[PDB]
Design a protein around this ligand. Structure first.
Ligand SMILES: *[B@@H-]1OC(=O)c2cc(/C=C/c3ccc4c(c3)C(=O)O[B-]4(O)O)ccc21
Ligand SMILES: *[BH-]1OC(=O)c2cc(/C=C/c3ccc4c(c3)C(=O)O[B-]4(O)O)ccc21
Lengths: 116, 115, 115, 116
Protein backbone atom coordinates (compact mmCIF):
# COMPACT_ATOMS: atom_id res chain seq x y z
CA UNK A 1 0.00 0.00 0.00
CA UNK A 2 2.01 2.97 -1.29
CA UNK A 3 -0.60 5.64 -0.39
CA UNK A 4 -2.97 5.51 2.61
CA UNK A 5 -5.21 8.18 4.18
CA UNK A 6 -6.30 8.29 7.84
CA UNK A 7 -8.83 10.79 9.20
CA UNK A 8 -9.84 11.51 12.82
CA UNK A 9 -12.74 13.55 14.27
CA UNK A 10 -11.61 15.99 17.03
CA UNK A 11 -15.20 16.76 18.18
CA UNK A 12 -16.22 13.12 18.76
CA UNK A 13 -12.81 11.62 19.64
CA UNK A 14 -13.26 8.89 17.02
CA UNK A 15 -12.18 7.89 13.53
CA UNK A 16 -13.91 9.98 10.86
CA UNK A 17 -15.98 7.39 9.00
CA UNK A 18 -17.26 7.60 5.41
CA UNK A 19 -15.09 10.58 4.43
CA UNK A 20 -14.79 10.88 0.65
CA UNK A 21 -11.24 11.32 -0.71
CA UNK A 22 -10.26 12.24 -4.29
CA UNK A 23 -6.65 11.99 -5.49
CA UNK A 24 -5.40 13.94 -8.52
CA UNK A 25 -2.06 13.95 -10.38
CA UNK A 26 -0.66 16.92 -12.29
CA UNK A 27 -0.54 16.15 -16.03
CA UNK A 28 1.99 17.28 -18.62
CA UNK A 29 -0.28 20.23 -19.51
CA UNK A 30 -0.41 21.42 -15.85
CA UNK A 31 -4.02 20.31 -15.23
CA UNK A 32 -5.15 18.03 -12.39
CA UNK A 33 -6.03 14.60 -13.78
CA UNK A 34 -8.23 12.30 -11.64
CA UNK A 35 -6.01 9.56 -10.22
CA UNK A 36 -7.97 7.54 -7.62
CA UNK A 37 -10.73 7.96 -5.07
CA UNK A 38 -12.44 6.21 -2.17
CA UNK A 39 -13.97 6.69 1.28
CA UNK A 40 -12.69 6.02 4.81
CA UNK A 41 -13.77 2.85 6.64
CA UNK A 42 -15.19 2.41 10.15
CA UNK A 43 -11.56 2.74 11.33
CA UNK A 44 -11.13 6.10 9.56
CA UNK A 45 -8.67 4.47 7.09
CA UNK A 46 -8.61 4.39 3.27
CA UNK A 47 -6.51 1.58 1.76
CA UNK A 48 -6.10 0.30 -1.78
CA UNK A 49 -6.10 3.65 -3.59
CA UNK A 50 -3.23 2.67 -5.92
CA UNK A 51 -0.41 0.21 -6.66
CA UNK A 52 3.36 0.49 -6.70
CA UNK A 53 3.30 0.23 -10.51
CA UNK A 54 0.69 2.98 -11.01
CA UNK A 55 1.99 5.41 -8.33
CA UNK A 56 4.81 6.92 -10.41
CA UNK A 57 6.73 10.16 -9.81
CA UNK A 58 4.52 13.22 -9.93
CA UNK A 59 2.81 16.03 -8.07
CA UNK A 60 -0.27 14.68 -6.30
CA UNK A 61 -3.25 16.39 -4.67
CA UNK A 62 -5.24 14.55 -1.99
CA UNK A 63 -8.60 16.29 -1.52
CA UNK A 64 -10.42 15.27 1.68
CA UNK A 65 -14.11 16.18 1.44
CA UNK A 66 -14.52 17.66 4.92
CA UNK A 67 -17.58 19.81 4.11
CA UNK A 68 -19.62 16.80 2.91
CA UNK A 69 -18.51 14.93 6.06
CA UNK A 70 -19.62 17.66 8.48
CA UNK A 71 -22.81 18.40 6.52
CA UNK A 72 -23.76 14.71 6.46
CA UNK A 73 -23.64 15.09 10.28
CA UNK A 74 -25.85 18.21 10.21
CA UNK A 75 -22.99 20.63 11.03
CA UNK A 76 -22.10 23.78 9.05
CA UNK A 77 -18.28 23.85 8.70
CA UNK A 78 -15.92 26.54 7.47
CA UNK A 79 -13.75 24.80 4.86
CA UNK A 80 -14.80 23.30 1.54
CA UNK A 81 -12.26 20.50 1.87
CA UNK A 82 -8.71 19.84 3.02
CA UNK A 83 -6.11 19.79 0.21
CA UNK A 84 -2.75 18.05 0.58
CA UNK A 85 -0.39 18.70 -2.37
CA UNK A 86 3.03 17.04 -2.60
CA UNK A 87 5.72 15.67 -4.91
CA UNK A 88 5.92 11.87 -4.56
CA UNK A 89 8.56 9.23 -5.37
CA UNK A 90 11.20 11.54 -6.80
CA UNK A 91 13.99 9.70 -4.94
CA UNK A 92 12.48 6.32 -5.74
CA UNK A 93 9.37 4.64 -4.37
CA UNK A 94 8.16 5.53 -0.88
CA UNK A 95 5.09 4.65 1.20
CA UNK A 96 2.96 7.66 2.22
CA UNK A 97 0.39 7.94 5.00
CA UNK A 98 -1.59 11.21 4.89
CA UNK A 99 -3.26 11.82 8.26
CA UNK A 100 -5.83 14.52 9.00
CA UNK A 101 -7.54 15.70 12.19
CA UNK A 102 -10.82 17.54 11.66
CA UNK A 103 -12.82 20.20 13.52
CA UNK A 104 -15.63 22.34 12.09
CA UNK A 105 -13.44 25.49 11.76
CA UNK A 106 -9.96 23.89 11.70
CA UNK A 107 -7.93 20.96 10.43
CA UNK A 108 -4.39 19.68 10.65
CA UNK A 109 -2.58 17.30 8.32
CA UNK A 110 0.71 15.46 8.57
CA UNK A 111 2.58 12.98 6.41
CA UNK A 112 4.44 9.81 7.41
CA UNK A 113 6.90 8.77 4.69
CA UNK A 114 8.72 5.43 4.92
CA UNK A 115 11.18 3.61 2.66
CA UNK A 116 10.20 -0.07 2.17
CA UNK B 1 -9.89 44.54 6.78
CA UNK B 2 -12.37 41.76 5.97
CA UNK B 3 -9.59 39.17 5.36
CA UNK B 4 -6.28 38.70 7.20
CA UNK B 5 -3.73 35.87 7.00
CA UNK B 6 -1.33 34.91 9.82
CA UNK B 7 1.44 32.32 9.46
CA UNK B 8 3.55 30.80 12.27
CA UNK B 9 6.67 28.60 12.28
CA UNK B 10 6.48 25.60 14.67
CA UNK B 11 10.17 24.68 14.29
CA UNK B 12 11.58 28.06 15.34
CA UNK B 13 8.66 29.33 17.45
CA UNK B 14 8.33 32.56 15.49
CA UNK B 15 6.21 34.34 12.90
CA UNK B 16 6.77 33.01 9.39
CA UNK B 17 8.23 36.09 7.68
CA UNK B 18 8.30 36.93 3.95
CA UNK B 19 6.02 34.05 2.94
CA UNK B 20 4.16 34.55 -0.33
CA UNK B 21 0.37 34.22 -0.12
CA UNK B 22 -2.03 34.17 -3.10
CA UNK B 23 -5.82 34.48 -2.81
CA UNK B 24 -8.09 33.24 -5.62
CA UNK B 25 -11.87 33.54 -6.28
CA UNK B 26 -13.78 30.67 -7.81
CA UNK B 27 -15.29 31.78 -11.13
CA UNK B 28 -18.59 30.65 -12.66
CA UNK B 29 -16.81 28.09 -14.88
CA UNK B 30 -15.01 26.59 -11.82
CA UNK B 31 -11.56 28.02 -12.61
CA UNK B 32 -9.55 29.85 -9.95
CA UNK B 33 -9.15 33.59 -10.68
CA UNK B 34 -6.39 35.66 -9.04
CA UNK B 35 -7.94 37.93 -6.42
CA UNK B 36 -5.20 39.35 -4.15
CA UNK B 37 -1.68 38.49 -2.98
CA UNK B 38 1.26 39.66 -0.89
CA UNK B 39 4.05 38.63 1.50
CA UNK B 40 3.75 38.16 5.26
CA UNK B 41 5.25 40.93 7.41
CA UNK B 42 7.81 40.68 10.21
CA UNK B 43 4.92 39.69 12.49
CA UNK B 44 3.83 36.90 10.13
CA UNK B 45 0.72 38.83 9.03
CA UNK B 46 -0.65 39.99 5.70
CA UNK B 47 -3.17 42.85 5.89
CA UNK B 48 -4.79 44.95 3.21
CA UNK B 49 -5.63 42.08 0.87
CA UNK B 50 -9.15 43.27 0.04
CA UNK B 51 -11.95 45.69 0.94
CA UNK B 52 -15.48 45.12 2.15
CA UNK B 53 -16.86 46.29 -1.21
CA UNK B 54 -14.78 43.74 -3.15
CA UNK B 55 -15.04 40.75 -0.76
CA UNK B 56 -18.42 39.40 -1.85
CA UNK B 57 -19.86 35.99 -1.00
CA UNK B 58 -18.27 33.16 -2.95
CA UNK B 59 -15.67 30.39 -2.68
CA UNK B 60 -12.07 31.51 -2.03
CA UNK B 61 -8.71 29.76 -1.95
CA UNK B 62 -5.72 30.97 0.07
CA UNK B 63 -2.43 29.41 -1.16
CA UNK B 64 0.59 29.75 1.16
CA UNK B 65 3.96 29.05 -0.54
CA UNK B 66 5.37 26.93 2.26
CA UNK B 67 7.88 25.08 0.06
CA UNK B 68 9.96 28.21 -0.69
CA UNK B 69 9.83 29.24 2.97
CA UNK B 70 11.39 25.97 4.16
CA UNK B 71 13.94 25.82 1.32
CA UNK B 72 15.14 29.32 2.26
CA UNK B 73 15.85 27.92 5.75
CA UNK B 74 17.73 24.92 4.35
CA UNK B 75 15.01 22.41 5.31
CA UNK B 76 13.46 19.90 2.92
CA UNK B 77 9.66 20.05 3.22
CA UNK B 78 6.84 17.72 2.19
CA UNK B 79 4.11 19.98 0.76
CA UNK B 80 4.18 22.03 -2.43
CA UNK B 81 2.12 24.65 -0.59
CA UNK B 82 -0.70 24.91 1.92
CA UNK B 83 -4.22 25.51 0.58
CA UNK B 84 -7.20 26.86 2.54
CA UNK B 85 -10.51 26.74 0.64
CA UNK B 86 -13.67 28.22 2.15
CA UNK B 87 -16.97 29.98 1.43
CA UNK B 88 -17.41 33.60 2.51
CA UNK B 89 -20.90 34.01 4.01
CA UNK B 90 -22.57 37.34 4.76
CA UNK B 91 -24.80 35.78 7.44
CA UNK B 92 -21.86 35.02 9.74
CA UNK B 93 -19.54 37.63 11.30
CA UNK B 94 -17.66 39.99 9.03
CA UNK B 95 -13.91 39.63 9.65
CA UNK B 96 -11.99 36.49 8.63
CA UNK B 97 -8.57 35.57 10.02
CA UNK B 98 -6.99 32.56 8.31
CA UNK B 99 -4.18 31.27 10.57
CA UNK B 100 -1.67 28.57 9.61
CA UNK B 101 0.99 26.83 11.73
CA UNK B 102 3.84 25.34 9.66
CA UNK B 103 6.13 22.33 10.15
CA UNK B 104 8.22 20.59 7.46
CA UNK B 105 5.87 17.56 7.20
CA UNK B 106 2.67 19.04 8.65
CA UNK B 107 0.49 22.10 8.82
CA UNK B 108 -2.59 23.14 10.72
CA UNK B 109 -5.05 25.90 9.89
CA UNK B 110 -7.97 27.50 11.68
CA UNK B 111 -10.43 30.27 10.92
CA UNK B 112 -11.25 33.03 13.41
CA UNK B 113 -14.44 34.78 12.30
CA UNK B 114 -15.48 37.79 14.35
CA UNK B 115 -17.60 40.94 14.27
CA UNK C 1 4.32 42.14 28.64
CA UNK C 2 6.83 39.28 28.81
CA UNK C 3 4.08 36.59 28.81
CA UNK C 4 0.77 36.50 26.91
CA UNK C 5 -1.75 33.68 26.47
CA UNK C 6 -4.14 33.34 23.51
CA UNK C 7 -6.89 30.71 23.27
CA UNK C 8 -8.98 29.83 20.20
CA UNK C 9 -12.08 27.66 19.69
CA UNK C 10 -11.86 25.28 16.69
CA UNK C 11 -15.54 24.25 16.84
CA UNK C 12 -16.99 27.76 16.57
CA UNK C 13 -14.08 29.51 14.80
CA UNK C 14 -13.78 32.22 17.44
CA UNK C 15 -11.68 33.40 20.36
CA UNK C 16 -12.22 31.31 23.48
CA UNK C 17 -13.71 33.91 25.84
CA UNK C 18 -13.78 33.89 29.67
CA UNK C 19 -11.47 30.89 30.01
CA UNK C 20 -9.61 30.67 33.31
CA UNK C 21 -5.83 30.43 33.04
CA UNK C 22 -3.42 29.74 35.93
CA UNK C 23 0.37 30.15 35.73
CA UNK C 24 2.66 28.33 38.19
CA UNK C 25 6.44 28.52 38.90
CA UNK C 26 8.38 25.40 39.76
CA UNK C 27 9.88 25.76 43.24
CA UNK C 28 13.19 24.35 44.48
CA UNK C 29 11.44 21.34 46.07
CA UNK C 30 9.65 20.54 42.75
CA UNK C 31 6.19 21.73 43.84
CA UNK C 32 4.16 24.08 41.65
CA UNK C 33 3.72 27.55 43.20
CA UNK C 34 0.94 29.91 42.06
CA UNK C 35 2.46 32.72 40.01
CA UNK C 36 -0.30 34.59 38.12
CA UNK C 37 -3.81 33.97 36.78
CA UNK C 38 -6.77 35.55 35.00
CA UNK C 39 -9.55 35.05 32.44
CA UNK C 40 -9.25 35.43 28.67
CA UNK C 41 -10.78 38.60 27.20
CA UNK C 42 -13.35 38.96 24.41
CA UNK C 43 -10.45 38.53 21.97
CA UNK C 44 -9.33 35.30 23.65
CA UNK C 45 -6.23 36.97 25.15
CA UNK C 46 -4.87 37.37 28.65
CA UNK C 47 -2.38 40.23 29.11
CA UNK C 48 -0.78 41.69 32.20
CA UNK C 49 0.09 38.38 33.84
CA UNK C 50 3.60 39.39 34.92
CA UNK C 51 6.37 41.98 34.58
CA UNK C 52 9.91 41.73 33.29
CA UNK C 53 11.28 42.13 36.82
CA UNK C 54 9.23 39.20 38.14
CA UNK C 55 9.51 36.82 35.14
CA UNK C 56 12.91 35.30 35.91
CA UNK C 57 14.39 32.18 34.32
CA UNK C 58 12.83 28.96 35.58
CA UNK C 59 10.26 26.29 34.69
CA UNK C 60 6.65 27.50 34.31
CA UNK C 61 3.31 25.77 33.83
CA UNK C 62 0.30 27.37 32.13
CA UNK C 63 -2.96 25.54 32.97
CA UNK C 64 -6.00 26.36 30.79
CA UNK C 65 -9.35 25.26 32.29
CA UNK C 66 -10.74 23.80 29.08
CA UNK C 67 -13.23 21.48 30.81
CA UNK C 68 -15.34 24.35 32.24
CA UNK C 69 -15.23 26.16 28.90
CA UNK C 70 -16.76 23.23 27.01
CA UNK C 71 -19.30 22.42 29.73
CA UNK C 72 -20.54 26.02 29.60
CA UNK C 73 -21.24 25.43 25.89
CA UNK C 74 -23.09 22.18 26.58
CA UNK C 75 -20.34 19.98 25.08
CA UNK C 76 -18.76 17.01 26.85
CA UNK C 77 -14.96 17.27 26.60
CA UNK C 78 -12.12 14.79 27.09
CA UNK C 79 -9.40 16.71 28.99
CA UNK C 80 -9.50 17.99 32.55
CA UNK C 81 -7.47 20.98 31.35
CA UNK C 82 -4.65 21.83 28.97
CA UNK C 83 -1.13 22.15 30.42
CA UNK C 84 1.82 23.94 28.81
CA UNK C 85 5.14 23.43 30.63
CA UNK C 86 8.28 25.24 29.50
CA UNK C 87 11.56 26.83 30.60
CA UNK C 88 11.96 30.60 30.36
CA UNK C 89 15.45 31.38 28.99
CA UNK C 90 17.07 34.81 29.00
CA UNK C 91 19.32 33.91 26.05
CA UNK C 92 16.39 33.65 23.64
CA UNK C 93 14.03 36.52 22.69
CA UNK C 94 12.14 38.29 25.43
CA UNK C 95 8.39 38.04 24.75
CA UNK C 96 6.50 34.74 25.03
CA UNK C 97 3.09 34.11 23.47
CA UNK C 98 1.54 30.78 24.46
CA UNK C 99 -1.25 30.00 21.97
CA UNK C 100 -3.74 27.12 22.30
CA UNK C 101 -6.37 25.87 19.84
CA UNK C 102 -9.20 23.93 21.51
CA UNK C 103 -11.47 21.08 20.36
CA UNK C 104 -13.53 18.76 22.59
CA UNK C 105 -11.15 15.77 22.17
CA UNK C 106 -7.97 17.57 21.09
CA UNK C 107 -5.82 20.62 21.61
CA UNK C 108 -2.75 22.09 20.00
CA UNK C 109 -0.33 24.62 21.42
CA UNK C 110 2.58 26.61 20.05
CA UNK C 111 5.01 29.17 21.41
CA UNK C 112 5.80 32.42 19.60
CA UNK C 113 8.96 33.91 21.07
CA UNK C 114 9.97 37.32 19.75
CA UNK C 115 12.06 40.40 20.54
CA UNK D 1 -5.08 -2.89 25.27
CA UNK D 2 -7.12 -0.31 27.19
CA UNK D 3 -4.54 2.53 26.91
CA UNK D 4 -2.18 3.09 23.96
CA UNK D 5 0.04 6.07 23.02
CA UNK D 6 1.12 7.01 19.48
CA UNK D 7 3.62 9.78 18.72
CA UNK D 8 4.62 11.30 15.36
CA UNK D 9 7.49 13.65 14.40
CA UNK D 10 6.33 16.63 12.26
CA UNK D 11 9.91 17.67 11.31
CA UNK D 12 10.97 14.26 9.94
CA UNK D 13 7.57 12.96 8.74
CA UNK D 14 8.06 9.72 10.68
CA UNK D 15 6.99 7.96 13.86
CA UNK D 16 8.71 9.41 16.93
CA UNK D 17 10.80 6.49 18.17
CA UNK D 18 12.09 5.91 21.71
CA UNK D 19 9.88 8.57 23.33
CA UNK D 20 9.59 8.02 27.08
CA UNK D 21 6.04 8.11 28.50
CA UNK D 22 5.05 8.19 32.20
CA UNK D 23 1.45 7.64 33.30
CA UNK D 24 0.17 8.84 36.69
CA UNK D 25 -3.16 8.40 38.51
CA UNK D 26 -4.59 10.86 41.03
CA UNK D 27 -4.70 9.27 44.50
CA UNK D 28 -7.24 9.77 47.28
CA UNK D 29 -5.00 12.46 48.81
CA UNK D 30 -4.88 14.45 45.51
CA UNK D 31 -1.27 13.54 44.66
CA UNK D 32 -0.12 11.97 41.38
CA UNK D 33 0.81 8.33 41.97
CA UNK D 34 3.03 6.58 39.37
CA UNK D 35 0.84 4.20 37.37
CA UNK D 36 2.81 2.84 34.39
CA UNK D 37 5.57 3.85 32.00
CA UNK D 38 7.29 2.82 28.78
CA UNK D 39 8.81 4.07 25.53
CA UNK D 40 7.54 4.19 21.93
CA UNK D 41 8.65 1.52 19.45
CA UNK D 42 10.06 1.89 15.93
CA UNK D 43 6.43 2.44 14.85
CA UNK D 44 5.97 5.31 17.33
CA UNK D 45 3.53 3.14 19.37
CA UNK D 46 3.48 2.21 23.07
CA UNK D 47 1.41 -0.89 23.91
CA UNK D 48 1.02 -2.93 27.07
CA UNK D 49 0.98 -0.07 29.59
CA UNK D 50 -1.87 -1.58 31.63
CA UNK D 51 -4.67 -4.18 31.81
CA UNK D 52 -8.44 -3.94 31.90
CA UNK D 53 -8.38 -5.05 35.56
CA UNK D 54 -5.79 -2.45 36.66
CA UNK D 55 -7.12 0.50 34.59
CA UNK D 56 -9.96 1.48 36.95
CA UNK D 57 -11.91 4.75 37.09
CA UNK D 58 -9.74 7.72 37.89
CA UNK D 59 -8.05 10.90 36.72
CA UNK D 60 -4.96 10.01 34.69
CA UNK D 61 -2.00 12.07 33.48
CA UNK D 62 0.00 10.90 30.47
CA UNK D 63 3.35 12.74 30.40
CA UNK D 64 5.17 12.48 27.06
CA UNK D 65 8.85 13.35 27.50
CA UNK D 66 9.24 15.58 24.44
CA UNK D 67 12.27 17.53 25.72
CA UNK D 68 14.35 14.35 26.21
CA UNK D 69 13.26 13.22 22.72
CA UNK D 70 14.33 16.43 20.97
CA UNK D 71 17.52 16.75 23.05
CA UNK D 72 18.51 13.15 22.29
CA UNK D 73 18.38 14.37 18.65
CA UNK D 74 20.55 17.42 19.42
CA UNK D 75 17.67 19.94 19.16
CA UNK D 76 16.75 22.54 21.79
CA UNK D 77 12.93 22.50 22.15
CA UNK D 78 10.54 24.82 23.95
CA UNK D 79 8.39 22.52 26.09
CA UNK D 80 9.46 20.33 28.99
CA UNK D 81 6.95 17.64 28.04
CA UNK D 82 3.40 17.21 26.77
CA UNK D 83 0.82 16.51 29.49
CA UNK D 84 -2.53 14.86 28.74
CA UNK D 85 -4.89 14.81 31.75
CA UNK D 86 -8.29 13.10 31.60
CA UNK D 87 -10.96 11.22 33.55
CA UNK D 88 -11.12 7.60 32.36
CA UNK D 89 -13.74 4.82 32.55
CA UNK D 90 -16.39 6.71 34.46
CA UNK D 91 -19.18 5.31 32.24
CA UNK D 92 -17.63 1.85 32.26
CA UNK D 93 -14.50 0.56 30.55
CA UNK D 94 -13.30 2.22 27.35
CA UNK D 95 -10.23 1.86 25.13
CA UNK D 96 -8.13 5.04 24.81
CA UNK D 97 -5.56 5.96 22.17
CA UNK D 98 -3.62 9.14 23.01
CA UNK D 99 -1.96 10.52 19.86
CA UNK D 100 0.58 13.34 19.75
CA UNK D 101 2.28 15.22 16.91
CA UNK D 102 5.54 16.93 17.84
CA UNK D 103 7.51 19.96 16.62
CA UNK D 104 10.29 21.75 18.50
CA UNK D 105 8.07 24.72 19.52
CA UNK D 106 4.61 23.12 19.22
CA UNK D 107 2.61 19.96 19.80
CA UNK D 108 -0.92 18.72 19.29
CA UNK D 109 -2.70 15.86 21.03
CA UNK D 110 -5.97 14.08 20.37
CA UNK D 111 -7.81 11.16 21.92
CA UNK D 112 -9.63 8.28 20.24
CA UNK D 113 -12.09 6.63 22.65
CA UNK D 114 -13.87 3.41 21.67
CA UNK D 115 -16.31 1.10 23.47
CA UNK D 116 -15.29 -2.58 23.13
B1 LIG E 1 -3.01 24.31 14.03
O1 LIG E 1 -2.35 23.91 15.35
C1 LIG E 1 -2.12 25.03 16.03
O2 LIG E 1 -1.57 24.99 17.14
C2 LIG E 1 -2.57 26.26 15.33
C3 LIG E 1 -2.47 27.58 15.78
C4 LIG E 1 -2.97 28.57 14.93
C5 LIG E 1 -2.95 30.09 15.24
C6 LIG E 1 -2.67 30.67 16.44
C7 LIG E 1 -2.70 32.22 16.51
C8 LIG E 1 -3.75 32.94 15.93
C9 LIG E 1 -3.80 34.34 15.97
C10 LIG E 1 -2.78 35.04 16.62
C11 LIG E 1 -1.75 34.30 17.19
C12 LIG E 1 -1.67 32.90 17.16
C13 LIG E 1 -0.78 35.23 17.81
O3 LIG E 1 0.26 34.91 18.41
O4 LIG E 1 -1.13 36.48 17.67
B2 LIG E 1 -2.45 36.60 16.90
O5 LIG E 1 -2.21 37.46 15.70
O6 LIG E 1 -3.39 37.33 17.72
C14 LIG E 1 -3.53 28.23 13.69
C15 LIG E 1 -3.62 26.91 13.26
C16 LIG E 1 -3.13 25.90 14.09
B1 LIG F 1 -2.84 17.80 13.18
O1 LIG F 1 -3.08 17.99 14.67
C1 LIG F 1 -3.24 16.80 15.20
O2 LIG F 1 -3.45 16.65 16.41
C2 LIG F 1 -3.14 15.69 14.21
C3 LIG F 1 -3.27 14.33 14.49
C4 LIG F 1 -3.14 13.42 13.44
C5 LIG F 1 -3.28 11.90 13.71
C6 LIG F 1 -2.30 10.99 13.40
C7 LIG F 1 -2.52 9.47 13.66
C8 LIG F 1 -3.22 9.00 14.78
C9 LIG F 1 -3.42 7.62 15.00
C10 LIG F 1 -2.91 6.69 14.08
C11 LIG F 1 -2.23 7.20 12.97
C12 LIG F 1 -2.02 8.56 12.74
C13 LIG F 1 -1.77 6.07 12.12
O3 LIG F 1 -1.13 6.17 11.06
O4 LIG F 1 -2.13 4.91 12.62
B2 LIG F 1 -2.92 5.08 13.92
O5 LIG F 1 -2.22 4.28 14.98
O6 LIG F 1 -4.21 4.45 13.72
C14 LIG F 1 -2.90 13.92 12.14
C15 LIG F 1 -2.77 15.30 11.87
C16 LIG F 1 -2.89 16.20 12.93
Amino acid sequence: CPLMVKVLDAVRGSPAINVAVHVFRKAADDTWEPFASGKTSESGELHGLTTEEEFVEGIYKVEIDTKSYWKALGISPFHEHAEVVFTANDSGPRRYTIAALLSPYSYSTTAVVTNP
